[PDB]
Design a protein around this motif. Structure first.
Motif, PDB file in Angstrom:
ATOM      1  N   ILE A  39      11.067   7.563  -1.470  1.00 42.03           N
ATOM      2  CA  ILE A  39      10.854   6.948  -2.732  1.00 42.03           C
ATOM      3  C   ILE A  39      11.022   7.642  -3.989  1.00 42.03           C
ATOM      4  O   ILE A  39      10.993   8.887  -3.604  1.00 42.03           O
ATOM      5  N   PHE A  57       3.329   8.733   5.521  1.00 43.28           N
ATOM      6  CA  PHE A  57       2.478   7.937   5.004  1.00 43.28           C
ATOM      7  C   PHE A  57       2.342   6.480   5.205  1.00 43.28           C
ATOM      8  O   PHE A  57       1.527   5.717   5.204  1.00 43.28           O
ATOM      9  N   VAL A  94      -5.832   8.810  -5.108  1.00 42.67           N
ATOM     10  CA  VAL A  94      -5.216   8.889  -3.856  1.00 42.67           C
ATOM     11  C   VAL A  94      -3.543   8.841  -4.049  1.00 42.67           C
ATOM     12  O   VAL A  94      -2.905   9.546  -3.398  1.00 42.67           O
TER      13      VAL A  94
HETATM   14  C1  HEM Z   1       2.050   7.461  -3.286  1.00 46.77           C
HETATM   15  C2  HEM Z   1       2.194   6.361  -2.216  1.00 46.77           C
HETATM   16  C3  HEM Z   1       2.387   5.078  -2.177  1.00 46.77           C
HETATM   17  C4  HEM Z   1       3.650   4.424  -2.190  1.00 46.77           C
HETATM   18  C5  HEM Z   1       4.953   5.058  -2.469  1.00 46.77           C
HETATM   19  C6  HEM Z   1       3.223   2.996  -2.263  1.00 46.77           C
HETATM   20  C7  HEM Z   1       4.124   1.945  -2.410  1.00 46.77           C
HETATM   21  C8  HEM Z   1       3.879   0.674  -2.401  1.00 46.77           C
HETATM   22  C9  HEM Z   1       5.083  -0.372  -2.297  1.00 46.77           C
HETATM   23  C10 HEM Z   1       6.417  -0.140  -2.762  1.00 46.77           C
HETATM   24  C11 HEM Z   1       4.288  -1.487  -2.346  1.00 46.77           C
HETATM   25  C12 HEM Z   1       4.813  -3.062  -2.527  1.00 46.77           C
HETATM   26  C13 HEM Z   1       5.338  -3.510  -4.082  1.00 46.77           C
HETATM   27  C14 HEM Z   1       5.675  -4.562  -4.230  1.00 46.77           C
HETATM   28  O1  HEM Z   1       6.430  -5.267  -3.544  1.00 46.77           O
HETATM   29  O2  HEM Z   1       5.481  -5.518  -5.387  1.00 46.77           O
HETATM   30  C15 HEM Z   1       2.729  -1.235  -2.418  1.00 46.77           C
HETATM   31  C16 HEM Z   1       1.821  -2.309  -2.208  1.00 46.77           C
HETATM   32  C17 HEM Z   1       0.456  -2.147  -2.235  1.00 46.77           C
HETATM   33  N1  HEM Z   1       0.070  -0.860  -2.002  1.00 46.77           N
HETATM   34 FE1  HEM Z   1       0.793   1.061  -2.028  1.00 46.77          FE
HETATM   35  N2  HEM Z   1       1.805   2.823  -2.273  1.00 46.77           N
HETATM   36  C18 HEM Z   1       1.268   4.036  -2.105  1.00 46.77           C
HETATM   37  C19 HEM Z   1       0.134   4.306  -2.149  1.00 46.77           C
HETATM   38  C20 HEM Z   1      -1.006   3.516  -2.062  1.00 46.77           C
HETATM   39  C21 HEM Z   1      -2.430   3.434  -2.029  1.00 46.77           C
HETATM   40  C22 HEM Z   1      -3.151   5.077  -2.009  1.00 46.77           C
HETATM   41  C23 HEM Z   1      -2.992   2.436  -2.007  1.00 46.77           C
HETATM   42  C24 HEM Z   1      -4.667   2.331  -1.889  1.00 46.77           C
HETATM   43  C25 HEM Z   1      -5.422   1.451  -2.631  1.00 46.77           C
HETATM   44  C26 HEM Z   1      -2.279   1.408  -1.956  1.00 46.77           C
HETATM   45  C27 HEM Z   1      -2.362   0.037  -1.748  1.00 46.77           C
HETATM   46  C28 HEM Z   1      -1.345  -0.954  -2.034  1.00 46.77           C
HETATM   47  C29 HEM Z   1      -1.588  -2.353  -2.006  1.00 46.77           C
HETATM   48  C30 HEM Z   1      -3.268  -3.022  -1.696  1.00 46.77           C
HETATM   49  C31 HEM Z   1      -0.461  -3.115  -1.978  1.00 46.77           C
HETATM   50  C32 HEM Z   1      -0.145  -4.607  -2.284  1.00 46.77           C
HETATM   51  C33 HEM Z   1      -0.251  -5.066  -0.701  1.00 46.77           C
HETATM   52  C34 HEM Z   1       0.509  -6.764  -0.844  1.00 46.77           C
HETATM   53  O3  HEM Z   1       0.565  -7.100  -1.907  1.00 46.77           O
HETATM   54  O4  HEM Z   1       0.210  -7.191   0.123  1.00 46.77           O
HETATM   55  N3  HEM Z   1      -0.890   1.825  -2.178  1.00 46.77           N
HETATM   56  N4  HEM Z   1       2.752   0.066  -2.161  1.00 46.77           N
END
Ligand code: HEM
Length: 82
Positions: A22, A34, A68
């Motif tokens: 990414i 991850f 985090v």
């Molecule tokens: C640096 C590492 C991370 C990357 C690259 C990342 C990337 C992403 C991406 C690309 C999405 C989807 C966005 C979309 O389609 O609108 C997402 C959703 C999400 N991420 Fe992360 N994330 C990371 C770390 C984390 C961490 C540490 C948490 C913990 C709190 C987290 C919690 C979530 C949640 C709750 C969603 C929404 C899922 C849903 O809509 O069902 N992420 N993340």
């Protein structure tokens, strides 16, 4: 991040759960290891091989767990976008 430079096109090729990069603030991050622990589940792939800066800086969960998120980013930079 180091000195390795990548084009946006090359980064785009890493868009799967076993080859997931990414872009964040012009940095290239290898998030492959991850994938399984991502609290958001498989949706991390929605930005696989793409820029996830806005998502990482503004999505509610990412903000709540900014410590985090930044820790993980700081363990994964492999280069920068050119
Ligand atoms: C640096 C590492 C991370 C990357 C690259 C990342 C990337 C992403 C991406 C690309 C999405 C989807 C966005 C979309 O389609 O609108 C997402 C959703 C999400 N991420 Fe992360 N994330 C990371 C770390 C984390 C961490 C540490 C948490 C913990 C709190 C987290 C919690 C979530 C949640 C709750 C969603 C929404 C899922 C849903 O809509 O069902 N992420 N993340």
């Amino acid at each position: 991040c180091g000195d390795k430079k990548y084009t946006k096109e090359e980064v785009a090729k890493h868009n799967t759960q076993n080859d997931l990069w990414i872009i964040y603030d012009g940095e290239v991050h290898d998030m492959t290891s991850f994938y399984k622990e991502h609290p958001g589940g498989k949706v991390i792939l929605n930005k696989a091989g793409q820029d996830a800066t806005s998502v990482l800086k503004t999505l509610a969960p990412h903000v709540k767990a900014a410590d985090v998120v930044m820790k993980k980013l700081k363990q994964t930079c492999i280069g920068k976008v050119k």
